[model samples]
Target: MRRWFHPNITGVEAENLLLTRGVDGSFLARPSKSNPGDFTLSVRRNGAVTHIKIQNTGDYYDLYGGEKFATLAELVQYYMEHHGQLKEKNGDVIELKYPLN
Candidate 1:
Protein backbone atom coordinates (compact mmCIF):
# COMPACT_ATOMS: atom_id res chain seq x y z
CA MET A 1 0.00 0.00 0.00
CA ARG A 2 1.04 3.65 -0.57
CA ARG A 3 0.96 6.46 1.92
CA TRP A 4 -1.18 9.35 0.69
CA PHE A 5 -0.43 12.01 3.25
CA HIS A 6 2.72 13.61 4.52
CA PRO A 7 3.00 15.56 7.78
CA ASN A 8 1.90 18.84 6.14
CA ILE A 9 0.74 17.92 2.68
CA THR A 10 -1.56 15.90 0.50
CA GLY A 11 -2.69 16.29 -3.08
CA VAL A 12 -6.07 17.60 -2.03
CA GLU A 13 -4.46 19.97 0.45
CA ALA A 14 -2.26 21.35 -2.26
CA GLU A 15 -5.33 21.83 -4.45
CA ASN A 16 -6.98 23.80 -1.66
CA LEU A 17 -3.95 26.03 -1.40
CA LEU A 18 -4.25 26.76 -5.06
CA LEU A 19 -7.95 27.44 -4.70
CA THR A 20 -7.28 29.90 -1.88
CA ARG A 21 -5.07 31.76 -4.28
CA GLY A 22 -8.02 32.05 -6.72
CA VAL A 23 -6.78 29.38 -9.04
CA ASP A 24 -9.47 27.59 -11.01
CA GLY A 25 -8.79 23.95 -11.63
CA SER A 26 -9.50 20.34 -10.85
CA PHE A 27 -7.51 17.75 -8.97
CA LEU A 28 -7.98 14.17 -10.01
CA ALA A 29 -6.61 11.16 -8.21
CA ARG A 30 -5.29 8.33 -10.36
CA PRO A 31 -6.18 10.18 -13.54
CA SER A 32 -4.07 8.08 -15.83
CA LYS A 33 -4.73 4.47 -16.63
CA SER A 34 -1.04 3.93 -17.25
CA ASN A 35 -0.08 5.19 -13.78
CA PRO A 36 -2.29 4.01 -10.98
CA GLY A 37 -1.09 6.28 -8.22
CA ASP A 38 -0.67 9.56 -10.05
CA PHE A 39 -2.58 12.72 -9.26
CA THR A 40 -3.41 15.44 -11.73
CA LEU A 41 -3.50 19.11 -10.82
CA SER A 42 -4.82 21.18 -13.68
CA VAL A 43 -5.43 24.93 -13.71
CA ARG A 44 -6.78 27.07 -16.49
CA ARG A 45 -6.83 30.81 -17.00
CA ASN A 46 -7.23 33.07 -19.98
CA GLY A 47 -7.65 30.02 -22.15
CA ALA A 48 -4.34 28.54 -21.09
CA VAL A 49 -3.86 25.38 -19.14
CA THR A 50 -1.25 24.54 -16.61
CA HIS A 51 -1.33 20.82 -16.11
CA ILE A 52 0.82 18.91 -13.65
CA LYS A 53 1.01 15.35 -12.52
CA ILE A 54 2.11 14.27 -9.08
CA GLN A 55 3.52 10.80 -9.13
CA ASN A 56 3.01 8.22 -6.41
CA THR A 57 6.48 8.90 -5.06
CA GLY A 58 5.57 12.58 -4.38
CA ASP A 59 7.49 13.97 -7.29
CA TYR A 60 5.67 16.11 -9.83
CA TYR A 61 6.20 17.35 -13.35
CA ASP A 62 4.71 20.15 -15.41
CA LEU A 63 3.19 18.82 -18.61
CA TYR A 64 3.58 22.13 -20.44
CA GLY A 65 7.23 22.78 -19.70
CA GLY A 66 8.59 19.44 -18.65
CA GLU A 67 9.86 20.94 -15.39
CA LYS A 68 10.26 18.49 -12.54
CA PHE A 69 9.14 19.43 -9.05
CA ALA A 70 10.20 17.76 -5.85
CA THR A 71 6.71 17.67 -4.39
CA LEU A 72 3.13 18.58 -5.21
CA ALA A 73 3.16 21.35 -2.62
CA GLU A 74 6.28 22.81 -4.14
CA LEU A 75 4.68 22.74 -7.57
CA VAL A 76 1.62 24.64 -6.33
CA GLN A 77 3.82 27.10 -4.46
CA TYR A 78 5.78 27.76 -7.60
CA TYR A 79 2.59 28.57 -9.47
CA MET A 80 1.43 30.81 -6.66
CA GLU A 81 4.66 32.72 -6.86
CA HIS A 82 4.88 32.90 -10.63
CA HIS A 83 1.34 32.87 -11.90
CA GLY A 84 1.32 36.60 -12.52
CA GLN A 85 4.00 36.26 -15.14
CA LEU A 86 2.44 33.23 -16.73
CA LYS A 87 1.25 33.89 -20.26
CA GLU A 88 -1.84 32.82 -22.06
CA LYS A 89 -1.95 30.99 -25.36
CA ASN A 90 -2.29 34.33 -27.10
CA GLY A 91 0.83 35.58 -25.30
CA ASP A 92 -0.88 37.94 -22.90
CA VAL A 93 -0.12 37.66 -19.21
CA ILE A 94 -2.94 36.15 -17.21
CA GLU A 95 -3.89 38.46 -14.40
CA LEU A 96 -4.20 36.78 -11.05
CA LYS A 97 -7.01 37.62 -8.64
CA TYR A 98 -4.91 37.04 -5.56
CA PRO A 99 -1.87 39.12 -4.81
CA LEU A 100 1.47 37.44 -4.39
CA ASN A 101 3.32 37.93 -1.14
Candidate 2:
Protein backbone atom coordinates (compact mmCIF):
# COMPACT_ATOMS: atom_id res chain seq x y z
CA MET A 1 0.00 0.00 0.00
CA ARG A 2 1.10 3.65 -0.24
CA ARG A 3 1.54 3.96 3.55
CA TRP A 4 -1.30 2.42 5.45
CA PHE A 5 -4.70 3.80 4.49
CA HIS A 6 -3.09 5.50 1.52
CA PRO A 7 -4.57 4.73 -1.85
CA ASN A 8 -2.46 2.77 -4.28
CA ILE A 9 -2.02 5.37 -6.96
CA THR A 10 -1.52 3.37 -10.13
CA GLY A 11 -3.64 5.65 -12.32
CA VAL A 12 -6.77 3.75 -11.33
CA GLU A 13 -9.91 4.81 -9.51
CA ALA A 14 -10.28 3.71 -5.91
CA GLU A 15 -12.39 0.67 -5.25
CA ASN A 16 -15.48 1.03 -3.11
CA LEU A 17 -16.12 -1.38 -0.26
CA LEU A 18 -17.88 -1.68 3.10
CA LEU A 19 -15.87 -0.41 6.07
CA THR A 20 -15.83 -2.33 9.34
CA ARG A 21 -14.23 -1.78 12.73
CA GLY A 22 -12.36 -5.05 12.83
CA VAL A 23 -14.01 -8.45 13.40
CA ASP A 24 -16.09 -7.52 16.42
CA GLY A 25 -18.13 -4.95 14.55
CA SER A 26 -21.04 -5.78 12.27
CA PHE A 27 -21.41 -4.23 8.84
CA LEU A 28 -25.17 -4.36 8.66
CA ALA A 29 -26.77 -0.99 7.98
CA ARG A 30 -29.89 -1.98 9.84
CA PRO A 31 -31.16 -1.09 13.28
CA SER A 32 -31.25 -3.77 15.90
CA LYS A 33 -32.40 -4.09 19.50
CA SER A 34 -28.92 -3.25 20.68
CA ASN A 35 -28.30 -0.36 18.36
CA PRO A 36 -31.49 1.45 17.51
CA GLY A 37 -29.87 4.72 16.55
CA ASP A 38 -28.72 5.88 13.15
CA PHE A 39 -25.05 5.35 12.45
CA THR A 40 -24.58 6.18 8.80
CA LEU A 41 -24.76 9.45 6.90
CA SER A 42 -25.28 9.89 3.16
CA VAL A 43 -24.28 13.10 1.42
CA ARG A 44 -23.89 14.43 -2.05
CA ARG A 45 -20.64 15.62 -3.62
CA ASN A 46 -21.75 19.08 -2.60
CA GLY A 47 -21.90 17.95 1.06
CA ALA A 48 -25.65 17.95 1.18
CA VAL A 49 -27.32 15.76 3.73
CA THR A 50 -29.38 13.15 1.96
CA HIS A 51 -30.02 10.28 4.37
CA ILE A 52 -28.86 8.64 7.56
CA LYS A 53 -28.87 4.94 8.33
CA ILE A 54 -28.57 3.09 11.59
CA GLN A 55 -26.01 0.38 12.11
CA ASN A 56 -23.70 -1.09 14.74
CA THR A 57 -20.61 -1.67 12.65
CA GLY A 58 -19.30 1.74 11.74
CA ASP A 59 -15.72 2.56 12.60
CA TYR A 60 -13.53 5.65 12.24
CA TYR A 61 -10.68 3.63 10.80
CA ASP A 62 -12.77 3.12 7.69
CA LEU A 63 -11.54 6.52 6.56
CA TYR A 64 -7.92 5.73 7.33
CA GLY A 65 -7.25 3.48 4.36
CA GLY A 66 -7.58 6.24 1.81
CA GLU A 67 -10.71 4.44 0.69
CA LYS A 68 -12.85 7.57 0.70
CA PHE A 69 -14.86 5.78 3.34
CA ALA A 70 -17.18 8.55 4.39
CA THR A 71 -20.21 8.12 6.61
CA LEU A 72 -23.62 9.00 5.23
CA ALA A 73 -23.69 11.98 7.57
CA GLU A 74 -20.21 13.19 6.64
CA LEU A 75 -20.98 12.97 2.95
CA VAL A 76 -24.14 14.97 3.32
CA GLN A 77 -22.56 17.57 5.55
CA TYR A 78 -19.50 17.97 3.37
CA TYR A 79 -21.46 17.99 0.16
CA MET A 80 -23.80 20.60 1.55
CA GLU A 81 -21.01 22.88 2.74
CA HIS A 82 -17.88 22.17 0.68
CA HIS A 83 -17.47 20.16 -2.52
CA GLY A 84 -15.10 17.26 -2.66
CA GLN A 85 -13.83 14.96 -5.38
CA LEU A 86 -15.15 11.43 -5.37
CA LYS A 87 -12.88 9.27 -7.48
CA GLU A 88 -15.01 7.94 -10.30
CA LYS A 89 -13.56 6.21 -13.33
CA ASN A 90 -15.86 8.01 -15.75
CA GLY A 91 -14.99 11.37 -14.15
CA ASP A 92 -18.65 12.30 -14.23
CA VAL A 93 -19.51 14.65 -11.39
CA ILE A 94 -22.87 14.49 -9.63
CA GLU A 95 -24.55 14.88 -6.31
CA LEU A 96 -23.04 12.58 -3.69
CA LYS A 97 -26.31 11.81 -2.03
CA TYR A 98 -26.42 8.61 0.02
CA PRO A 99 -29.48 6.76 1.28
CA LEU A 100 -29.69 5.71 4.93
CA ASN A 101 -32.50 3.27 4.60
Candidate 3:
Protein backbone atom coordinates (compact mmCIF):
# COMPACT_ATOMS: atom_id res chain seq x y z
CA MET A 1 0.00 0.00 0.00
CA ARG A 2 1.06 3.58 -0.48
CA ARG A 3 2.45 5.48 2.50
CA TRP A 4 -0.49 7.78 2.34
CA PHE A 5 -2.98 4.94 2.16
CA HIS A 6 -4.13 4.45 5.72
CA PRO A 7 -6.25 1.61 7.04
CA ASN A 8 -9.92 2.14 7.53
CA ILE A 9 -10.61 5.00 9.93
CA THR A 10 -13.65 6.97 10.89
CA GLY A 11 -14.00 10.66 10.10
CA VAL A 12 -13.51 11.62 13.75
CA GLU A 13 -10.53 9.31 14.20
CA ALA A 14 -8.68 10.69 11.17
CA GLU A 15 -8.46 14.15 12.74
CA ASN A 16 -5.87 12.71 15.10
CA LEU A 17 -3.51 12.48 12.15
CA LEU A 18 -4.81 14.99 9.64
CA LEU A 19 -5.35 17.89 12.02
CA THR A 20 -2.71 17.33 14.65
CA ARG A 21 0.15 16.42 12.35
CA GLY A 22 -0.80 17.54 8.87
CA VAL A 23 0.09 20.83 7.26
CA ASP A 24 -2.33 23.02 5.31
CA GLY A 25 -2.31 20.81 2.21
CA SER A 26 -1.34 17.45 3.65
CA PHE A 27 -3.65 14.56 2.84
CA LEU A 28 -4.20 10.81 3.24
CA ALA A 29 -6.32 8.07 1.75
CA ARG A 30 -8.23 5.71 4.03
CA PRO A 31 -11.02 3.24 3.70
CA SER A 32 -14.23 4.55 5.14
CA LYS A 33 -15.45 2.88 8.31
CA SER A 34 -18.87 4.39 7.69
CA ASN A 35 -18.88 2.57 4.35
CA PRO A 36 -16.18 -0.03 4.24
CA GLY A 37 -16.98 -0.87 0.66
CA ASP A 38 -15.51 2.44 -0.44
CA PHE A 39 -12.69 4.82 0.39
CA THR A 40 -12.34 8.32 1.80
CA LEU A 41 -9.90 11.08 0.93
CA SER A 42 -8.94 13.20 3.93
CA VAL A 43 -7.05 16.43 3.72
CA ARG A 44 -5.82 19.12 6.10
CA ARG A 45 -7.12 22.29 4.54
CA ASN A 46 -6.03 25.53 6.21
CA GLY A 47 -6.67 24.54 9.87
CA ALA A 48 -9.63 22.22 9.45
CA VAL A 49 -9.87 18.83 7.78
CA THR A 50 -11.96 17.66 4.85
CA HIS A 51 -13.27 14.29 3.68
CA ILE A 52 -13.99 13.41 0.10
CA LYS A 53 -15.79 10.13 -0.40
CA ILE A 54 -14.57 7.82 -3.16
CA GLN A 55 -16.52 5.09 -4.85
CA ASN A 56 -14.92 1.97 -6.25
CA THR A 57 -17.11 -0.14 -8.46
CA GLY A 58 -16.51 -2.32 -11.48
CA ASP A 59 -16.29 0.77 -13.62
CA TYR A 60 -13.43 2.20 -11.55
CA TYR A 61 -12.79 4.64 -8.71
CA ASP A 62 -14.35 8.06 -8.85
CA LEU A 63 -15.54 11.13 -6.95
CA TYR A 64 -19.23 10.39 -7.61
CA GLY A 65 -19.40 12.92 -10.41
CA GLY A 66 -16.95 13.47 -13.23
CA GLU A 67 -13.50 11.86 -13.51
CA LYS A 68 -12.90 8.13 -13.28
CA PHE A 69 -9.57 6.58 -12.46
CA ALA A 70 -8.20 3.08 -12.80
CA THR A 71 -7.13 2.94 -9.15
CA LEU A 72 -7.42 4.83 -5.89
CA ALA A 73 -3.73 5.67 -5.78
CA GLU A 74 -3.93 6.95 -9.32
CA LEU A 75 -6.96 8.95 -8.28
CA VAL A 76 -5.02 10.66 -5.50
CA GLN A 77 -2.01 10.90 -7.72
CA TYR A 78 -4.10 12.58 -10.35
CA TYR A 79 -5.13 15.28 -7.96
CA MET A 80 -1.59 15.55 -6.63
CA GLU A 81 0.03 15.80 -10.05
CA HIS A 82 -2.52 18.42 -10.98
CA HIS A 83 -2.57 20.87 -8.10
CA GLY A 84 -5.51 22.79 -9.49
CA GLN A 85 -7.65 19.67 -9.96
CA LEU A 86 -9.08 19.12 -6.51
CA LYS A 87 -11.53 21.64 -5.18
CA GLU A 88 -14.77 21.96 -3.27
CA LYS A 89 -17.94 22.88 -5.12
CA ASN A 90 -17.93 26.16 -3.26
CA GLY A 91 -14.66 27.09 -5.04
CA ASP A 92 -12.31 26.04 -2.27
CA VAL A 93 -9.10 24.87 -3.90
CA ILE A 94 -7.42 21.88 -2.25
CA GLU A 95 -3.71 21.93 -2.80
CA LEU A 96 -2.17 18.55 -2.02
CA LYS A 97 1.28 19.34 -0.75
CA TYR A 98 2.12 15.89 0.66
CA PRO A 99 0.86 12.85 2.42
CA LEU A 100 -0.21 13.31 6.04
CA ASN A 101 1.42 10.00 6.86
Candidate 4:
Protein backbone atom coordinates (compact mmCIF):
# COMPACT_ATOMS: atom_id res chain seq x y z
CA MET A 1 0.00 0.00 0.00
CA ARG A 2 1.13 3.55 -0.62
CA ARG A 3 2.34 5.21 2.54
CA TRP A 4 1.47 8.73 1.57
CA PHE A 5 -1.55 10.28 -0.08
CA HIS A 6 -2.10 13.51 -1.99
CA PRO A 7 -5.35 15.31 -2.75
CA ASN A 8 -5.75 17.88 -5.52
CA ILE A 9 -7.01 21.46 -5.50
CA THR A 10 -8.93 22.87 -8.46
CA GLY A 11 -7.37 26.34 -8.45
CA VAL A 12 -4.87 28.65 -6.87
CA GLU A 13 -7.35 29.90 -4.32
CA ALA A 14 -8.18 26.41 -3.13
CA GLU A 15 -4.50 25.61 -2.83
CA ASN A 16 -3.90 28.71 -0.80
CA LEU A 17 -6.81 27.88 1.53
CA LEU A 18 -5.30 24.54 2.48
CA LEU A 19 -1.82 25.95 2.93
CA THR A 20 -3.03 28.89 4.99
CA ARG A 21 -5.67 27.15 7.09
CA GLY A 22 -3.59 24.04 7.76
CA VAL A 23 -2.44 25.84 10.89
CA ASP A 24 -5.69 27.52 12.00
CA GLY A 25 -8.09 24.54 11.58
CA SER A 26 -11.21 26.25 10.24
CA PHE A 27 -12.24 27.65 6.87
CA LEU A 28 -15.25 27.97 4.59
CA ALA A 29 -15.93 26.98 1.02
CA ARG A 30 -19.08 27.74 -0.90
CA PRO A 31 -19.62 26.04 -4.24
CA SER A 32 -22.19 28.68 -5.20
CA LYS A 33 -19.55 31.32 -4.62
CA SER A 34 -16.78 32.15 -7.08
CA ASN A 35 -15.26 28.73 -6.64
CA PRO A 36 -17.68 26.01 -7.63
CA GLY A 37 -17.63 22.45 -6.31
CA ASP A 38 -15.77 23.65 -3.25
CA PHE A 39 -15.69 21.88 0.11
CA THR A 40 -13.92 22.60 3.37
CA LEU A 41 -12.42 20.45 6.10
CA SER A 42 -11.58 21.71 9.56
CA VAL A 43 -9.15 19.87 11.82
CA ARG A 44 -9.12 20.90 15.43
CA ARG A 45 -7.16 20.25 18.59
CA ASN A 46 -7.64 21.29 22.20
CA GLY A 47 -10.72 23.34 21.43
CA ALA A 48 -8.58 25.24 18.92
CA VAL A 49 -8.03 25.01 15.22
CA THR A 50 -5.23 22.77 14.07
CA HIS A 51 -5.83 22.78 10.34
CA ILE A 52 -8.38 23.80 7.72
CA LYS A 53 -8.77 23.66 3.97
CA ILE A 54 -11.06 24.38 1.08
CA GLN A 55 -10.91 21.87 -1.74
CA ASN A 56 -12.60 21.56 -5.08
CA THR A 57 -14.59 18.44 -5.87
CA GLY A 58 -13.67 18.78 -9.53
CA ASP A 59 -10.13 17.79 -8.69
CA TYR A 60 -11.21 14.60 -6.96
CA TYR A 61 -13.92 13.73 -9.47
CA ASP A 62 -11.26 11.83 -11.39
CA LEU A 63 -9.81 10.32 -8.24
CA TYR A 64 -6.11 10.77 -7.52
CA GLY A 65 -3.43 9.04 -5.43
CA GLY A 66 -4.38 5.57 -6.59
CA GLU A 67 -7.69 4.22 -5.21
CA LYS A 68 -10.80 6.03 -4.04
CA PHE A 69 -11.32 5.68 -0.33
CA ALA A 70 -14.74 4.40 0.64
CA THR A 71 -14.97 6.89 3.46
CA LEU A 72 -13.04 9.63 5.22
CA ALA A 73 -13.16 7.55 8.38
CA GLU A 74 -10.73 5.07 6.89
CA LEU A 75 -8.31 7.82 5.97
CA VAL A 76 -8.38 9.35 9.40
CA GLN A 77 -7.84 5.96 11.02
CA TYR A 78 -4.88 5.16 8.86
CA TYR A 79 -3.34 8.53 9.53
CA MET A 80 -3.73 8.16 13.27
CA GLU A 81 -2.54 4.56 13.39
CA HIS A 82 0.42 4.68 11.03
CA HIS A 83 1.53 8.25 11.40
CA GLY A 84 3.40 7.97 14.67
CA GLN A 85 4.47 10.53 17.26
CA LEU A 86 1.06 11.64 18.49
CA LYS A 87 1.38 13.05 21.98
CA GLU A 88 -1.87 13.11 23.93
CA LYS A 89 -2.38 15.14 27.09
CA ASN A 90 -5.31 14.84 29.41
CA GLY A 91 -7.86 17.66 29.07
CA ASP A 92 -5.68 19.09 26.34
CA VAL A 93 -5.19 17.87 22.76
CA ILE A 94 -3.17 15.40 20.77
CA GLU A 95 -0.15 16.54 18.79
CA LEU A 96 1.33 14.82 15.77
CA LYS A 97 5.07 14.81 15.21
CA TYR A 98 5.22 13.81 11.59
CA PRO A 99 8.35 11.89 10.68
CA LEU A 100 10.23 13.07 7.63
CA ASN A 101 10.93 10.31 5.19
Candidate 5:
Protein backbone atom coordinates (compact mmCIF):
# COMPACT_ATOMS: atom_id res chain seq x y z
CA MET A 1 0.00 0.00 0.00
CA ARG A 2 3.03 2.28 0.30
CA ARG A 3 5.33 3.73 -2.30
CA TRP A 4 8.14 1.47 -1.12
CA PHE A 5 6.38 -1.58 -2.51
CA HIS A 6 7.84 -2.85 -5.78
CA PRO A 7 5.97 -5.85 -7.16
CA ASN A 8 7.94 -7.43 -10.03
CA ILE A 9 11.59 -6.70 -9.32
CA THR A 10 14.05 -9.54 -8.77
CA GLY A 11 16.59 -9.77 -5.94
CA VAL A 12 19.47 -8.86 -8.22
CA GLU A 13 17.65 -5.81 -9.47
CA ALA A 14 17.00 -4.82 -5.89
CA GLU A 15 20.68 -5.14 -4.99
CA ASN A 16 21.67 -3.12 -8.01
CA LEU A 17 19.27 -0.37 -7.12
CA LEU A 18 20.10 -0.32 -3.46
CA LEU A 19 23.82 -0.51 -3.85
CA THR A 20 24.24 1.88 -6.74
CA ARG A 21 21.79 4.56 -5.83
CA GLY A 22 20.65 4.11 -2.28
CA VAL A 23 22.46 5.15 0.85
CA ASP A 24 22.32 3.47 4.21
CA GLY A 25 18.78 2.82 5.44
CA SER A 26 17.18 3.00 2.00
CA PHE A 27 14.90 0.03 1.38
CA LEU A 28 12.12 -1.45 -0.74
CA ALA A 29 9.71 -4.37 -0.62
CA ARG A 30 9.15 -6.74 -3.50
CA PRO A 31 7.68 -10.13 -4.29
CA SER A 32 9.77 -13.15 -3.36
CA LYS A 33 11.46 -15.68 -5.62
CA SER A 34 12.06 -18.32 -2.97
CA ASN A 35 8.35 -19.02 -2.55
CA PRO A 36 5.13 -18.04 -4.24
CA GLY A 37 3.08 -15.28 -2.56
CA ASP A 38 5.95 -14.37 -0.27
CA PHE A 39 7.90 -11.09 -0.28
CA THR A 40 11.44 -9.82 0.27
CA LEU A 41 12.52 -6.71 2.08
CA SER A 42 15.71 -5.36 0.50
CA VAL A 43 17.56 -2.83 2.60
CA ARG A 44 20.78 -0.92 2.14
CA ARG A 45 22.83 -1.28 5.28
CA ASN A 46 26.37 -0.11 5.99
CA GLY A 47 27.77 -0.56 2.48
CA ALA A 48 25.81 -3.63 1.48
CA VAL A 49 22.26 -4.59 0.69
CA THR A 50 20.59 -7.26 2.76
CA HIS A 51 17.47 -9.05 1.57
CA ILE A 52 15.25 -10.05 4.45
CA LYS A 53 12.58 -12.65 3.83
CA ILE A 54 8.98 -11.70 4.38
CA GLN A 55 6.65 -14.63 4.61
CA ASN A 56 3.05 -14.31 3.52
CA THR A 57 0.83 -17.25 4.44
CA GLY A 58 -2.61 -15.75 3.72
CA ASP A 59 -3.19 -14.90 7.36
CA TYR A 60 -0.42 -12.28 7.83
CA TYR A 61 3.07 -11.16 6.96
CA ASP A 62 6.11 -11.78 9.13
CA LEU A 63 9.88 -11.45 8.84
CA TYR A 64 11.34 -14.80 9.65
CA GLY A 65 10.14 -15.73 13.17
CA GLY A 66 9.77 -12.08 14.15
CA GLU A 67 6.57 -10.15 14.84
CA LYS A 68 3.71 -10.52 12.36
CA PHE A 69 1.54 -7.88 10.77
CA ALA A 70 -1.63 -7.87 8.73
CA THR A 71 -0.11 -6.05 5.76
CA LEU A 72 3.32 -5.44 4.23
CA ALA A 73 3.02 -1.69 4.59
CA GLU A 74 2.18 -2.05 8.24
CA LEU A 75 5.26 -4.14 8.77
CA VAL A 76 7.55 -1.70 7.00
CA GLN A 77 5.90 1.24 8.67
CA TYR A 78 6.33 -0.30 12.07
CA TYR A 79 10.07 -0.72 11.59
CA MET A 80 10.39 2.80 10.26
CA GLU A 81 8.57 4.24 13.22
CA HIS A 82 10.31 2.13 15.82
CA HIS A 83 14.06 2.24 15.80
CA GLY A 84 15.95 -0.88 16.92
CA GLN A 85 12.86 -2.91 16.05
CA LEU A 86 14.53 -4.57 13.05
CA LYS A 87 17.68 -6.57 13.52
CA GLU A 88 19.82 -9.31 12.05
CA LYS A 89 21.32 -12.44 13.55
CA ASN A 90 24.48 -10.53 14.49
CA GLY A 91 22.31 -7.95 16.25
CA ASP A 92 22.91 -5.28 13.62
CA VAL A 93 19.90 -2.99 13.52
CA ILE A 94 18.41 -2.55 10.08
CA GLU A 95 17.04 0.93 9.84
CA LEU A 96 14.18 1.61 7.43
CA LYS A 97 14.45 5.34 7.06
CA TYR A 98 14.13 5.88 3.33
CA PRO A 99 11.91 4.15 0.81
CA LEU A 100 13.64 3.70 -2.54
CA ASN A 101 10.65 3.91 -4.81
Candidate 6:
Protein backbone atom coordinates (compact mmCIF):
# COMPACT_ATOMS: atom_id res chain seq x y z
CA MET A 1 0.00 0.00 0.00
CA ARG A 2 1.15 3.50 -0.75
CA ARG A 3 1.73 5.70 2.23
CA TRP A 4 -0.47 8.75 2.36
CA PHE A 5 0.81 10.50 5.46
CA HIS A 6 3.99 10.82 7.43
CA PRO A 7 4.04 10.20 11.13
CA ASN A 8 6.58 12.93 11.56
CA ILE A 9 6.12 16.31 9.90
CA THR A 10 7.97 19.59 9.91
CA GLY A 11 6.64 22.68 11.59
CA VAL A 12 6.24 24.36 8.21
CA GLU A 13 4.00 21.56 6.94
CA ALA A 14 1.78 21.85 10.02
CA GLU A 15 1.55 25.61 9.63
CA ASN A 16 0.73 25.27 5.95
CA LEU A 17 -2.07 22.88 6.73
CA LEU A 18 -3.65 25.41 9.09
CA LEU A 19 -3.16 28.27 6.68
CA THR A 20 -4.67 26.38 3.76
CA ARG A 21 -7.70 25.61 5.86
CA GLY A 22 -7.94 29.31 6.83
CA VAL A 23 -7.49 28.50 10.51
CA ASP A 24 -6.66 31.69 12.31
CA GLY A 25 -4.61 30.13 15.07
CA SER A 26 -1.29 28.47 15.74
CA PHE A 27 0.09 24.94 16.01
CA LEU A 28 3.19 23.08 17.04
CA ALA A 29 4.50 19.81 15.63
CA ARG A 30 6.85 17.80 17.74
CA PRO A 31 8.16 14.29 18.01
CA SER A 32 6.64 12.09 20.66
CA LYS A 33 9.04 11.34 23.43
CA SER A 34 7.50 8.04 24.46
CA ASN A 35 6.67 6.66 21.04
CA PRO A 36 9.65 6.68 18.75
CA GLY A 37 7.63 6.65 15.55
CA ASP A 38 4.80 8.88 16.65
CA PHE A 39 4.48 12.63 16.57
CA THR A 40 2.17 15.15 18.13
CA LEU A 41 0.39 18.11 16.62
CA SER A 42 -0.58 20.58 19.30
CA VAL A 43 -3.14 23.16 18.32
CA ARG A 44 -4.39 26.25 20.09
CA ARG A 45 -7.72 27.74 19.08
CA ASN A 46 -9.15 30.72 20.91
CA GLY A 47 -7.37 29.62 24.10
CA ALA A 48 -8.58 26.01 23.90
CA VAL A 49 -5.99 23.31 23.36
CA THR A 50 -6.20 20.17 21.25
CA HIS A 51 -3.88 17.45 20.09
CA ILE A 52 -3.58 14.91 17.29
CA LYS A 53 -1.33 11.92 17.53
CA ILE A 54 0.10 10.63 14.26
CA GLN A 55 1.12 7.01 14.41
CA ASN A 56 3.81 5.32 12.39
CA THR A 57 1.26 3.57 10.24
CA GLY A 58 -0.03 6.94 8.97
CA ASP A 59 -3.22 6.91 10.98
CA TYR A 60 -4.01 9.78 13.29
CA TYR A 61 -6.14 9.98 16.40
CA ASP A 62 -7.82 13.17 17.53
CA LEU A 63 -7.14 13.54 21.20
CA TYR A 64 -9.96 16.00 21.68
CA GLY A 65 -12.69 13.93 20.04
CA GLY A 66 -11.29 10.42 20.49
CA GLU A 67 -11.60 9.76 16.78
CA LYS A 68 -9.31 8.05 14.34
CA PHE A 69 -8.49 9.57 10.96
CA ALA A 70 -6.99 7.91 7.92
CA THR A 71 -4.63 10.71 7.22
CA LEU A 72 -3.42 13.98 8.60
CA ALA A 73 -5.11 15.94 5.85
CA GLU A 74 -8.42 14.30 6.61
CA LEU A 75 -8.01 15.09 10.27
CA VAL A 76 -7.26 18.73 9.60
CA GLN A 77 -10.14 19.08 7.16
CA TYR A 78 -12.55 17.54 9.60
CA TYR A 79 -11.37 19.84 12.35
CA MET A 80 -11.79 22.92 10.18
CA GLU A 81 -15.30 22.02 9.12
CA HIS A 82 -16.67 20.64 12.36
CA HIS A 83 -14.76 22.39 15.13
CA GLY A 84 -16.75 25.58 14.76
CA GLN A 85 -15.37 28.77 13.26
CA LEU A 86 -11.73 29.61 13.63
CA LYS A 87 -11.09 32.63 15.75
CA GLU A 88 -8.24 35.02 16.21
CA LYS A 89 -6.79 36.20 19.49
CA ASN A 90 -9.11 39.16 19.28
CA GLY A 91 -12.12 36.82 18.80
CA ASP A 92 -12.67 37.71 15.13
CA VAL A 93 -13.81 34.63 13.26
CA ILE A 94 -11.93 33.51 10.22
CA GLU A 95 -13.90 32.28 7.24
CA LEU A 96 -13.13 29.09 5.40
CA LYS A 97 -13.93 29.43 1.71
CA TYR A 98 -13.64 25.81 0.67
CA PRO A 99 -16.75 23.68 0.75
CA LEU A 100 -16.82 19.93 1.17
CA ASN A 101 -17.21 18.26 -2.19
Q: Against the true structure, whose lDDT is highest?
A: 5
Best candidate according to TM-score: 5
Candidate 3 — worst ten consecutive residues by lDDT sum? 1-10
In the range 1-101, model 5's lDDT, one tens digit per residue, is: 57888886889999998888899999999988888788889999889999888988799988877889999888888889998989976888889889998
Predicted structure 4: lDDT: 0.34
* Cα deviation of 69, candidate 6, in Å: 1.4
Q: Once superposed on the true structure, which residue ranges of model 6 sit more than 4 Å away at CA?
A: 1-24, 45-65, 84-101
RMSD of each: 8.1, 15.8, 1.6, 12.6, 1.2, 8.0
TM-score for each prediction? 0.37, 0.25, 0.88, 0.27, 0.92, 0.39
| Pairs with backbone N, CA or C atoms under 3 Å apart (clashes), candidate 3 | none
Q: How far off is residue 100 in model 4, in Å? A: 28
lDDT of candidate 1 at residue 91, scale 0 to 100 = 66
TM-score of 5: 0.92
* lDDT order of candidates, top first: 5, 3, 6, 1, 4, 2
Q: Candidate 2, which ten residues in sequence have the lowest lDDT sum?
A: 9-18
Better of 4 and 5 by TM-score: 5
Report the error of model 4 at residue 60, Å.
6.7
lDDT of each: 0.44, 0.28, 0.82, 0.34, 0.88, 0.48
Across residues 31-92, which tens digit of lDDT does each residue of candidate 2 receive?
Answer: 22333433332223332222223332355312212233335444334433443443223554
- In model 2, the Cα lDDT at residue 44 comes to 31
What does candidate 4's lDDT look like per residue over 1-101, in tens digits?
22212334333544455455544322222222334443323334444433322333443321123223444434334444543422233333343322111
lDDT of 6 by residue, 1-101 (tens): 11223345554554455455424355544666547566665564543434445565544544334457775556556555765544434554433323211
Q: What's model 1's overall lDDT?
A: 0.44
User: Which sequence of candidate numbers ranks them by TM-score, best first?
Assistant: 5, 3, 6, 1, 4, 2
